[PDB]
Ligand binder design. Structure first.
Ligand SMILES: C[C@]12CCc3c(ccc4cc(O)ccc34)[C@@H]1CCC2=O
Ligand SMILES: C[C@]12CCc3c(ccc4cc(O)ccc34)[C@@H]1CCC2=O
Lengths: 124, 124
């Protein structure tokens, strides 16, 4: 905990900006060294900056990301947000609806991220 | 951890429907008998149907609720959804934006629920 409810809304909106531009290195600097990511939730986790970097380089190396509603934030450093990811799959233009939950540490870095989505949230 | 992702989407949308109509009986029964709920997340857990039913008894005891986006569903019995609650803050109508994350058991009942929101999500 520590970042405020207001700080958490901003940190999370910023994360979506970076994904939308595709600035891979800025994204990764947002995560704690030790951060763990579960994306999609239900999969073995990604542990550490290095492994986390790999996901973004591979997934983000023509993708667009837009928040589709307000960031919901608590007072113990956690937040949840709904967004859409636009991409192209084998020529097929797709959109994926996702909801992510994040826990920030005292330095304002992402310690934990979990993403909720599956094929049922895939759209053409 | 057994309803399918499509089943999760349906269970969760039903729950918003019952909340909307105020069917407190039907809601409580959606929960496991020893389910735990954190609403708001950050607040200590209310446990077991009796305690959970008290939340809905008094909370919903001119409240409207509606999904404001698709229910995101995983493959391990978890789902997350964005919705808004409309109530009255003494005299004036306001709205609250919430995101809830739910885990279901083999019986299709809510074993856990976490509600993400704070004052930053309240608009008059
Ligand atoms: C990897 C991916 C692109 C980006 C992306 C996906 C899923 C969840 C995400 C969550 C994020 O916080 C940021 C980016 C993604 C997609 C799944 C299919 C695909 O092409
Ligand atoms: C109790 C309440 C009405 C309903 C409600 C609130 C907060 C979270 C909720 C989560 C639910 O899954 C269902 C209903 C609510 C509101 C807080 C202020 C208020 O009037």
């Amino acid at each position: 905990n520590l970042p405020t409810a207001q700080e958490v809304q901003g940190l999370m909106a910023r994360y979506i900006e970076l994904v939308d531009v595709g600035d891979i290195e800025a994204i990764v600097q947002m995560y704690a060294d030790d951060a763990t990511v579960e994306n999609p939730f239900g999969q073995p986790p990604i542990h550490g900056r290095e492994q986390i970097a790999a996901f973004y380089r591979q997934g983000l190396g023509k993708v667009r990301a837009c928040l589709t509603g307000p960031v919901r934030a608590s007072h113990n450093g956690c937040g949840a947000m709904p967004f859409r990811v636009e991409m192209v799959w084998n020529g097929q233009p797709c959109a994926l609806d996702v909801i992510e939950v994040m826990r920030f540490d005292e330095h304002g870095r992402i310690q934990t991220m979990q993403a909720y989505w599956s094929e049922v949230n895939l759209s053409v």
